[PDB]
Amino acid sequence: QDVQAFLKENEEVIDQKMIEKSLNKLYEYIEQSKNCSYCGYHPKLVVNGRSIDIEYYECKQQSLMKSMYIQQDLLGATFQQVDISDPSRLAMFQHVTDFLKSYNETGKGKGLYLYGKFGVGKTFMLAAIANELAEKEYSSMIVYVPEFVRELKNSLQDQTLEEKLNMVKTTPVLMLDDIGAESTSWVRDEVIGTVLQHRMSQQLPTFFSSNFSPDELKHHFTYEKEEVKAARLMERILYLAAPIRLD
Amino acid sequence: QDVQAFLKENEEVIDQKMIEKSLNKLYEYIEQSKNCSYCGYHPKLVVNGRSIDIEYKKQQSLMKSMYIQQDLLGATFQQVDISDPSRLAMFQHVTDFLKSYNETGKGKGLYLYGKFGVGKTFMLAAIANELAEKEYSSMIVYVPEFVRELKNSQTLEEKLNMVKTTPVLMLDDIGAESWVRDEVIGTVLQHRMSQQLPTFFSSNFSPDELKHHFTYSQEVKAARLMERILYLAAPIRLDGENRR
Amino acid sequence: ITGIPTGFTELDRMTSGFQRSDLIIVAARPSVGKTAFALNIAQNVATKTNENVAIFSLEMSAQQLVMRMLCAEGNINAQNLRTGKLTPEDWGKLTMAMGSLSNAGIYIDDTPSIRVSDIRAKCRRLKQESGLGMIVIDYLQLIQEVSEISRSLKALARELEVPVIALSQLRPMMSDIRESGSIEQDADIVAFLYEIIIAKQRNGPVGTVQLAFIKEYNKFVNL
């Protein structure tokens, strides 16, 4: 309601274009919860350059667990902490136990697909496979995706972060995150092309869970001879993961 | 100028940018015939994802009730007896608002919940003549007779355009026949909360009961259908002797 | 702007013009539009510098077309400015519609189902009648029997010493103005409307460009 008032107040200055460009944002803004159940954050609009974003304003395994590009305040959820009256959270319950079993060192199997809205928390659900693959002497790492483009375009003076991913590619249960409206297009044939080869040079299971869907994740990165280069290196992402269904 | 009017009309629903994106639609909407010829369809705006589409006494006259008996809809207020918390804890939300009803500012409706026969629909058909002292296109409907012929097909692209954002909707009875109703009334009740609108309810059971009865399987699609019907108002009791 | 201006500033750092002597055809689509393109190739070029113009609006009376650019220069077309007395409000931004379109020099048009020897006898005393910067002629699919007109439309930019315009109403590519015309050997810069597919010249620049639309004011947008 405040946005409406402000919009018409300065509509002579703001205009409409930017509005139509950020339509998706403004529509998603109004469609979601304006409030929060803590009354922990609330959505507010912010102008960032030429685009309008949505920021939130506030209303045995610890020295083993050392996840890069993410905190340790994010990895503290199990599965017995996870509710089932929703049609999403139990899917995970049935999925991973059957993968506590088909793999006895080297398996080359399937994966999981949590994609869609913004509220479930697809890193707390993943901070659970990460949570109890560390009672053992092994892992299920969690590293964010846009951070492979946040500190990886200024520093290409050879090596740097061509040599800290060298060992983050020797852990089996590695999980891939927010691919879609979070990560511009130099990276896919030098990193996320060479991410899914050397693990599959001996074959293994890898993971992908973000927000933008399968028959859509192949398309969000042509930022044809552009859609097809988004149909080879990704023919090892949909070739290595099975979807979960947000009913 | 029309855009300004429409924008603020549905500003609760529209995301400023959504308006400019669906500009062509909204402009084509207003430019075409807002009426029909059966009086066979009329255009109404609907929000589909990020885009807005276009889907098709001398007091009881221009009204347009759906699927109801012809002359049963005549009821007053002096004639309505005033009894228990069936009629002495309701004329406190009804009369605070009479000649003071806006659009561009959500109003409070009511949910008449209770028994099988006492007086479900005498406080949604009486007030439909307070919505006849001013005369709205006030809708009165049997929802037992609504999930049948609209399962059918012929014509089906747009069958509920008078069961969404009309100035008034006195919904009566839902007691027959993961449901065939989550992309139906569950998105119908979505346009009753972002284009500035209130609605009116009365049925056979109750809020507790109806939540325990809707949509069954082996999914909280049964406990989301009914707070789309417990938002604009707080439900109150109906008590008294039987009337048959 | 080399030149007496083309259309857009990212379309005047592209191809560059309008320069000395060119036959032009912007083969404009039905269904989508060709109305506001004229309200954005010859709407501001008269109202800034004294290389004035003229507007050919053949098949329709020139005066119905005067609800198109005044409702696009004074940004007033939603109350509405095509049917009588407005509500005591839309008499607001009138000071921008005709307040610049009369201190220039224009001859709007709707003279009979013409051949083309008119704008030869007419343009022998309209080069000497007006001020001249562009000469905006109707779409290339009425004047007659359609192909002959474009062939003798090349020379027209070379007489009055000003580039001359004649659009079209046939994807859109260069082989649909062909299913009703000739053109290729004649017009050597064919822009379009879906997207101004300016895919023809020797000057250098040729690109893929569409623009945003508002249609409550009929406005074009570049970025």
Numbering used by the authors:
A (entry chain M): 32 to 70, 82 to 101, 112 to 235, 237 to 276, 281 to 304
B (entry chain N): 32 to 70, 82 to 98, 111 to 207, 211 to 234, 238 to 278, 284 to 309
C (entry chain F): 183 to 326, 338 to 363, 374 to 397, 413 to 441
Sentences from the paper on this structure:
The replicative hexameric DnaB helicase is composed of two domains that are connected by one flexible linker. The larger CTD exhibits a classical RecA fold, binds the nucleoside triphosphate and translocates the protein on the DNA, whereas the NTD surrounds the single-stranded DNA (ssDNA) during DNA unwinding and binds the primase1920. The DnaI helicase loader belongs to the AAA+ family of ATPases2526. Here we report a crystal structure of BstDnaB helicase in complex with BsuDnaI loader protein and the HBD of BstDnaG primase at 7.5 Å resolution.
The overall architecture of the 570-kDa complex exhibits a three-layered ring structure along the c axis of the crystal. The NTDs of BstDnaB together with the HBDs of BstDnaG form the first ring that lies on the top of the second ring, which consists of the CTDs of BstDnaB. The NTDs of BstDnaB pack into a more rigid triangular collar shape that exhibits a threefold symmetry, whereas the CTDs have a relatively loose collar shape with a pseudo sixfold symmetry. The BsuDnaI on the bottom forms the loosest triangular collar of trimer of dimers with an obvious threefold symmetry as well. The CTDs of hexameric BstDnaB helicase interact with both the NTDs and the CTDs of the helicase loader BsuDnaI with a total contact surface area of ~1,745 Å2 per hexamer. Therefore, it appears that the NTDs of BsuDnaI have the major role in recruiting the helicase loader into the prepriming complex. The CTDs of one dimer (chains N and O) exhibit a different orientation from the others and do not directly interact with the CTDs of the helicase.
